[PDB]
Design a binder for this molecule. Sequence first.
Ligand SMILES: O=S([O-])[O-]
Ligand SMILES: O=S([O-])[O-]
Ligand SMILES: [Cl-]
Ligand SMILES: [Cl-]
Ligand SMILES: [Cl-]
Ligand SMILES: [Cl-]
Length: 416
Amino acid sequence: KTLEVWIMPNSPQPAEDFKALVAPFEKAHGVEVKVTVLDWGVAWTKITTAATSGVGPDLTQLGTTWVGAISAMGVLEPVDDVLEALGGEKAYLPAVWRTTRLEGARQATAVPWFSELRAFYYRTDALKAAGVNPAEMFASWQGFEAGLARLKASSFRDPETKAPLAPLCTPGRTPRTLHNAAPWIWGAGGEIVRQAGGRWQSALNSPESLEGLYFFLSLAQKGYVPAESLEKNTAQIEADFQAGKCAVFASGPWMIQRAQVPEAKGGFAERTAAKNLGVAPYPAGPKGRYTFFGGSNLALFNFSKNKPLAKELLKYLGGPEAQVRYAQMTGMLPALRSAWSDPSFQQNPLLRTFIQAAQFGRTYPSLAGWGGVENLAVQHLGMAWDLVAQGRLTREALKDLMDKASAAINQALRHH
Ligand SMILES: O=S([O-])[O-]
Ligand SMILES: O=S([O-])[O-]
Ligand SMILES: [Cl-]
Ligand SMILES: [Cl-]
Ligand SMILES: [Cl-]
Ligand SMILES: [Cl-]
């Protein structure tokens, strides 16, 4: 009677890392845990097929934004008991607690596993050369844009590339998520959706959502993001920062680990970027400072024949030791807030800065139809990036694109 867990590729050797993570559990319970790794490309279909058919694992990883949809299909075992065992609501950042259930539900259907959050990496050497104070640049929108202007004008050249750096790298081609836009929307006082007028509705066409989205998108149109960045994807921009092409770029905590180890093990300790690496939280907008939170949770299918032992494994994976260990393996932040005290975070100044950024964490409402909302939002955000690529984004053009986004989202939110 052996547990079956489904995971996605969260670490360099996903199945073996997971098996090393649960070795102490296996010993204590006299059990083997079986793991299957699902590519992110097919994980959603595999998990919805398990949901509809009843053919699946005991435990599955879920992206945080998936919890509403799978919970609303009726297939997840309540895990309030597990979360209470881990410390209950105060054991988590509120944005992370929000991901434990369908929005508005009283019963928890998912256990927080690990957190993606995003902050700005910068080249300490580039900002020093351009006369930019990092505290000022990453404090506010005005500091941020003034910084990028100084970096655009800087005579500084990367030691290894012998070329100027792009002030900001951000991808403009084929956006799959709102995660790079959301902090700007939120900082302006906006949101992606809201409860207004008795309904969930798009808030992308609100003046405040448009202010934040225009502020961000216009940086690229002012020459702070080179056309070559605009043209690209998400591991390219990490490769670009590593390769000394970008002064500033947003990423998660995994780049810190990578900066600390040589090319041998898949790091960039050798590159000028590793030796001149800073991190700062997103700047405050006019209506607040917000950090995007994502990541993954664990869930138990209620058709499992080993729910008792599966709940023990959720307690283990969700708990302090496994939280610290799996954060190291994945390069993510623990979902269990107590684990942030661990020396592995507190002895690394760049990881302490991520924990500073964590205090401002926010995430999307846990809606059953969240995926439809985000798919329509990203499609229209990509239309906006396309106007940037032509230098044709105006405030009126962005407003028109988000009014079309909002009609489509509102229609999708009226259907289940
Ligand atoms: O329903 S609203 O998009 O007119
Ligand atoms: O616009 S109707 O399809 O909800
Ligand atoms: Cl939140
Ligand atoms: Cl974006
Ligand atoms: Cl939102
Ligand atoms: Cl304009």
